[PDB]
Structure formats: C-alpha cells, structure tokens
Design a protein around this ligand. Structure first.
Ligand code: HEM
Ligand code: HEM
Ligand code: 9M9
Ligand code: 9M9
Ligand code: H4B
Ligand code: H4B
Ligand code: ZN
Lengths: 405, 404
C-alpha cells in the first residue's frame, strides 16, 4: 500500500515499512540494473551550508525546539560564520548529539542498541602529536575501565581549509604487529604488515612475536607522524583458554580487550573530523572467527583441528565448523573468566532486533547492512538472518577515508 | 560503469561487464539497497524483441550466428508473432533456454553443474493426469536409486486469456504440516497452507511428522486434482549420527530430491508457469534451515538436551554445537545411504571455480551474496570473502503468485 520499502521478518511473519530512508541525502552504489550491496568499499560553501542547515535542524528536533527563536538564531549564526570564514564550529552539545547520531546511523554496526550510551570526549583543542597521545591514553584508560568496558569516542580538531589533517595512522589503537618472513610467510597478524613496516621505517625497534602490540603513529597538522609506544599496563589483554580442552591454553593465543577503531572519518553537518577514534567492546565472533580463523589472518583452524584430532583431509567431516565453534567458545570463556566485557553473537543479534523495533517507533526505520549484521558463523541460528533490512546513508556518519601515505 | 569486484582473501580483482546485458530492473535504487529482500514488491513488439534476443543467444551458442538457419528462424518467429501474438520454441532452443536460466540464477550455489541438465519436453500435456505421469517419470529419472541427476520437466507455456498449467505444491516432495488446535504444528510448518488445501480437496491426512504430501495439479481453468505419489518413488534417508548413538532414536528423516515446482521459467518472452526442476541437496539446506529454523521443525533445543549441553545461556554456544552435529548427521546418513549430497564447503569451493569459468566465458556472473553464503560457518567458506554483483539476465527463473 504505502510508497516505502516493505520489510519482512520471515521467522515471525511481521511486516514494517521503512519511511526513514526518505531522509537519505546521499546515494549509495546500487542501481535498478545491479545491486552492489556486497561490496566492502564501492566507488563549495553552498554545499556546506545545506548540510549544516540540515544538521542544525536535526539537533533542534532532538531537543524539541524546532521552529523556535533559538533554532533560527543558530541557523543565522552558522550561515554568518560560513560567510566570513568558509567553515563553522559546533557547540559542544551539538558535537555530542552528532557523534551519537553517527553511531546510530552506522548500517554495519550490530551493537547500536547501546547508541545513546556513548561517552564523548571533546579534544578539539589539541594542538600537537604529544597531546593527541595524552588524549588517546586517557581514552583507553576510561574506555577499558579495568575490564568493565565503556563506549567512548575522542574527537580531535576538524579538517580546516588551508591546514593539514590530524590523523592517526593505525587502523585501531591496539593492533598486533605483522612481520614478513624471508620465506614469504607472516609472523603475527598479516592484516598489519603495511603499518608494521611504516612503524619500522619511522624508527620503531621491531619485536618478533605473534602478539607484539604496535606503537601509535600520530600525525598533527602539516607535520610528519610521530611514534608513540603505549605503556603495556594500559593495554589489557586476555590469554585464551578453553573450558574443557586443556591443551588449548598451551597454544599461547591471546587477544586485546578494546576494539578501538581509529582510522574512520566522522562527518557532522558538513564538518569533517579526520581523527575521532572510538571504541566499544567485542563481539566474540570478531575475535574467534574472523581474526583467528580467516585464512588471510592468523589462520589457526587447521592447527586447532589437528589438536582436536579431526579428519582434516575431507570437507565432509565438518572439521572447520567444529574447530571454529571451540575457538569461539574459548574466546567467550576466557573473557568471562578474566572479567572483561564481551558479547556472543546470539546475545548481540537478539539485542539488535530490539534496536530495530525501537527505531521503527522512534524514526520509522533503521539503515542496516545485512551482510555485515549477520554473524560469520551460525548465521541462520540468529534472528537477524530472517530479517529483511534496508541499507542507506544517513548523516551524521562515520566514513572510510584514504590512508595518509 | 563497470563494477570492480574484489576477493578479500586473495587480493584479486575482476570487473563485471556482463551486467550491461541486463534488461530487467531489480529492487535497488541509489537512495536505498533492498538486496536482502526475498521477493519482489510486486505487447507484440516487446515479445518480439525478447524473442529476437533469445534466438540470437541460441544461434550464438551453436557458433551459427548470421547463418541462414539463424535468419530463417528469426523470420519464423516474426511471422508467428505478427499473426498469432505469440510463438513456440523448438525443442533444442527450449533445452538451451532452460540451461541458461539455471546458469543465470543468482541465488544458486550449484551452478558449476549448469551444462548438465536433462530436459523433458512436456509441452504436449493436456490434462492433470498427464502432468502426473510426466512428474512421476521426472522423479524416477532424477532419483536414479540415489545417484541423483539434475532434470527439468517443462509443461505448456502460458497463453492469453487462458488459465495456466500450475503445480500447487512448492516442491514435488513435501512433508505435511498439521495445525493442531492447541497452537502447535505437527510436521513441517512451512506447509500448513498447502496441507489444508489438499485435505479440503479430498485428501485423507496422516498424523505424522513426515507424511509426504499428495500433488495438487491444475490444468487450465479447471479445479486442481489430487494425486498420491507412489511411495516407492519417493526416496527418503533416515538420519543417524556417526558417533552419537541416540541420534537415530529421534526418528528424523528427509527426502533425497529437492524438486522446486512453483517457479516460472521465462525464455525469450514465453513463460512456463509449470516447469519443475531438481538437482541434489546441499547438506545445510536440510540440517540447518529445514530442521533447525525456528519456524520449521525447530529441533535445536531437543538435540542440545540429548547432548547434555547448557541450554540456559547463549554463551555456551549450545546452538552452534547442536547445529554442527545435525549437519554432520545429514552428511553421514546420505553418504551411508548412497544418496548424492554436497557439503557447504565443497559446494562453495566449486562455486568459486564457477565464477572463474564464467569470468572468462561471459565477463561476469550474477550472484546473490546473501543466498550463496551458507547459513552456518559463512566466513569459513571462500564465497564469504568474495564480492558479488547481483542482476537479472534472461532466460530466468522467476517467482509467481500462488494460484489460489
Ligand atoms: C558497544 C559495543 C559495540 C559492539 C558489540 C559493536 C559491534 C560491531 C561489530 C561486530 C561490527 C562489525 C565489525 C567488523 O566485522 O569488523 C561493528 C561495526 C561498526 N561499528 Fe559497532 N560495536 C560497538 C560499539 C560501537 C561504537 C561505540 C561505535 C562508534 C561510536 C561503533 C561504530 C561502528 C561502525 C562505524 C562500524 C562499521 C565499521 C566499518 O564499516 O568498517 N560501534 N560494530
Ligand atoms: C545440482 C545440484 C544443485 C545444488 C547443490 C543446488 C544448490 C542450491 C541451493 C543451496 C540453493 C539455495 C536454496 C534455498 O536456500 O532455498 C539454490 C537455489 C536455486 N537453485 Fe540451485 N542447486 C542445484 C541444482 C539446480 C538446478 C538443476 C536448477 C534449475 C534447473 C537450480 C536453480 C535454482 C534456482 C532458480 C534457485 C533460487 C531459488 C529461489 O530463489 O527460491 N538449481 N540452489
Ligand atoms: N575490515 C577492515 C577493518 C580493519 C580494522 C578494524 C575494523 O573494524 C571495524 C569495526 C568498527 C567498530 C567496531 C566497534 C565495536 C566492535 N566490537 N567492533 C568494531 C569493528 C575493520
Ligand atoms: N525460499 C522459499 C522456498 C520454498 C520452497 C522451496 C524452495 O527451494 C528453493 C530451491 C530452489 C532450487 C534448488 C535446487 C537445488 C537445491 N538443492 N535446492 C534448491 C532450493 C524455496
Ligand atoms: C565480500 C564481503 O562483503 C566481505 O567478506 C564482508 C562480508 N561481511 C562482513 N561482515 C562483517 N561484520 N565484517 C566484515 O568484514 C565482512 N566482510
Ligand atoms: C531475510 C533474508 O534475506 C532471508 O532470510 C534469506 C537470507 N539468505 C538465504 N539464503 C538461502 N540460500 N536461502 C534462503 O532462504 C535465504 N533467506
Ligand atoms: Zn543493492
């Protein structure tokens, strides 16, 4: 009936219509001719002003002051600023609203039930790489909270016309070195080979373990990046063991507590924050399935299966599935034992369904990327697999941005 | 222009140029992507152009484009449309057309097999009774005592102002779902509706979990008729587990033959509303979806208790553990019964080979990532890490409304 995408849950037989996609002001990669939804990364003051105006409208709606005198005055205040400087500045509460709305809008994030609970650290006064490092250490401290993890984001100064960007070169604040061997293989995390070599080129003395924490490469405006080593006591790690397989602890596997993405661009009202690292807590499949079992990551599936004495010579023994389960179980068990926040893929997806229901009421829809929301093991066992989803770009947003080298 | 398609495990890139051959709109727009939706929301020159396009594909396939036979065939098609408003395929064209439809099906992981398809021409069928005979031969052929062979039977095409030939069942072999008035469903909940239609059309129902349904067959503008399949035709596989002795006690079983019977086959503008086709099962279809889905047989918790797992909490991964053992039970049992089946790792490996073949042959391959990636152990298979482009090519299989 209604002129909006009809969305169905196939488990429950229930129907909704997404009206929120009508608010999208940016085109994704799909056309009537072909869907490109499985692609990870598919390909003027007038423009700023319209984006700025739209954000200010969003802000004044969220506080129920739409059409008010303060709303119209903030609009004139922004247009004047842009008219005289070519850019504008956010009030602090606007920044807080904006950062939360960007998380809420992130189609690939399954943890958005938590979106209203986000600690926003304003670091827009930062003026050096040393200072960026201080803000980052404080972020890690506050966010780690000795294992009782707390979502947080730290926002550094915005892109300025006629000035270089603040950038954190690492993709996360905590990552394991990846050392290329003279036989062609990689010791450590192959995902991090490039950044490891950049750190070395920049004066880092490399280790040679499988789990060496990388230093941070931090770039203040118009300067070369400076290298900073995180004090080990700030980086909480969890040694992995299995509740019944005693040999598993002997594998010497471990992972860090805090997933702190640091290379994404935060866009609010046309303003761009090139350095705004944020962190939450892990879903167990991120560590146990992707980081440890991806063939192009640590790739330990065959090793674990041999320890479990599975028939690894034939696909039909399901050895890969059996090993993957035990690895995921080890991750969950070890984090719980160490008292570090973690969420399994069942609890996470069930909570995401609650979030879809909340947002249907609050906003008439919720942009979601099915391929990213459905977990990488046990897909159809979770309720999100059976939920149709509409994907679209809303602003404020987190966006990929090219690497600074 | 042309999508750059990347495999994130191997670092390799291809470009899909085949998508430019699409003449039919999917549901996505630049404003929003609707790729995760299961079903679509909703003269003579049009038919003639689809017909010319198809005839051109056919003569190109036999390396005979431009030949006189090619030219004469286009004229035949034109003369027949101009006079009658439609036309008819030759058997060879029909065979080529059915294989291309399978090749083009973006949701099918089994397409490495596409060139090997037995095509039964049933277009000389005039009654429900004759459809039933054709269907029985199809099932006999395809089952082949456990050595399954892909096949399609094609019933007469749709015609203007005349009702369609339709098979009301969604598959030739389905288990009944009985709605006990105490809320629950006995049997397969996906089939409550069809089970009830069968009863009211005079079927004597059973009361089991795996009662094979009768076929409701409909010839144009007639009430459908009920036919019971001779039980010796329907190969079934009892499920047992290689190491869990109690598993067999559950009395679980599934049929050998996945034979979809409610999809429309479109070739060169002609539509075939009854054209059931069958291949062989991938184990996750049975183990994961049919048995473990919450709105199907839903056996997870039962199995998990038999394995003495902690059902209290999600974090013990009881569901993942029980699902793996069910999938193993299916593979084991089919292998023991000498009935063809393929596991999701073998299937997806072969699909990657298919993408490579098709990249060289046609410059691309339409693929629905959400359907190709298996429902358990997704990222443990190579397709997970493969970007894919989805689009509609003709000939094609399509969904169509239920005939009731
Ligand atoms: C609080 C607990 C959280 C959980 C359990 C969670 C979970 C996840 C997961 C599993 C993914 C997929 C990541 C991958 O496969 O690599 C993801 C993506 C994402 N998350 Fe969340 N998240 C949480 C907090 C946050 C926070 C605090 C933010 C931002 C303030 C956030 C923003 C994002 C964004 C932008 C993506 C997409 C990243 C990309 O496209 O590469 N998440 N999240
Ligand atoms: C030979 C072995 C085959 C295997 C292993 C196989 C595998 C599969 C699987 C796993 C699916 C997903 C089904 C679901 O989740 O419900 C599928 C879908 C599909 N298959 Fe294949 N298939 C085979 C043969 C065939 C044949 C012979 C045809 C047609 C001639 C075909 C056409 C299709 C179509 C049109 C779909 C999409 C169905 C839909 O949208 O509901 N397949 N296949
Ligand atoms: N796939 C590329 C790549 C490289 C490095 C990090 C990364 O992380 C994505 C991401 C972003 C935010 C997250 C928030 C919480 C969480 N548990 N995982 C999260 C994962 C993605
Ligand atoms: N998803 C709705 C629905 C209802 C009934 C049957 C069905 O089957 C889809 C389908 C189609 C073709 C197949 C070919 C081979 C196979 N193993 N499964 C196949 C499964 C799908
Ligand atoms: C090709 C495909 O899009 C790619 O492998 C995606 C699939 N789904 C994903 N889902 C999540 N959560 N994270 C990922 O990195 C990916 N990778
Ligand atoms: C909503 C979602 O698109 C739907 O559950 C899809 C997901 N992927 C699938 N994949 C296959 N092979 N079969 C299916 O029925 C589905 N269902
Ligand atoms: Zn799309």
């Amino acid at each position: 009936g209604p002129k909006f995408p009809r969305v169905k849950n196939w488990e429950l037989g229930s129907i909704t219509y997404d009206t929120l996609c009508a608010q999208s002001q940016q085109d994704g990669p799909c056309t009537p001719r072909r869907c490109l939804g499985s692609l990870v990364l598919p390909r003027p003051a007038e423009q700023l002003l319209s984006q700025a105006r739209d954000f200010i409208n969003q802000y004044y709606s969220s506080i129920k002051r739409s059409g008010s005198q303060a709303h119209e005055e903030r609009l004139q205040e922004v247009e004047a600023e842009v008219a005289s400087t070519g850019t504008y500045h956010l009030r602090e509460s606007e920044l807080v609203f904006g950062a939360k709305q960007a998380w809420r809008n992130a189609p690939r994030c399954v943890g958005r039930i938590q979106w209203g609970k986000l600690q926003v650290f304003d670091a827009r006064d930062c003026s050096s790489a040393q200072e960026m490092f201080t803000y980052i250490c404080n972020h890690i401290k506050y966010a780690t909270n000795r294992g009782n993890l707390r979502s947080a984001i730290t926002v550094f100064p915005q892109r300025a016309p006629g000035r270089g960007d603040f950038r954190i070169w690492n993709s996360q604040l905590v990552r394991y070195a990846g050392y290329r061997q003279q036989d062609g293989s990689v010791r450590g995390d192959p995902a991090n080979v490039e950044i490891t070599e950049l750190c070395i080129q920049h004066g880092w003395t490399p280790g040679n373990g499988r789990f060496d924490v990388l230093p941070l490469l931090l770039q203040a405006p118009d300067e070369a990046p400076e290298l900073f080593v995180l004090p080990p006591e700030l980086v909480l790690e969890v040694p992995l063991e299995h509740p019944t397989l005693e040999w598993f602890a002997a594998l010497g596997l471990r992972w860090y507590a805090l997933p702190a993405v640091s290379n994404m661009l935060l866009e609010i009202g046309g303003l761009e924050f090139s350095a705004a690292p944020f962190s939450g807590w892990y879903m167990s499949t991120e560590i146990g399935t992707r980081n440890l079992c991806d063939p192009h990551r640590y790739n330990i599936l065959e090793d674990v299966a041999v320890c479990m004495d599975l028939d690894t010579r034939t696909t039909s023994s399901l050895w890969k599935d059996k090993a993957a389960v035990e690895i995921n179980l080890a991750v969950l068990h070890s984090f719980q034992l160490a008292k570090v926040t973690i969420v399994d893929h069942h609890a996470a997806t069930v909570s995401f369904m609650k979030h879809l229901d909340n947002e249907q009421k609050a906003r008439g829809g919720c942009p979601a990327d099915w391929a990213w929301i459905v977990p990488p093991i046990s897909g159809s066992l979770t309720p999100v697999f059976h939920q149709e989803m509409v994907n679209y770009i809303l602003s404020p947003a987190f966006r990929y941005q090219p690497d600074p080298w």
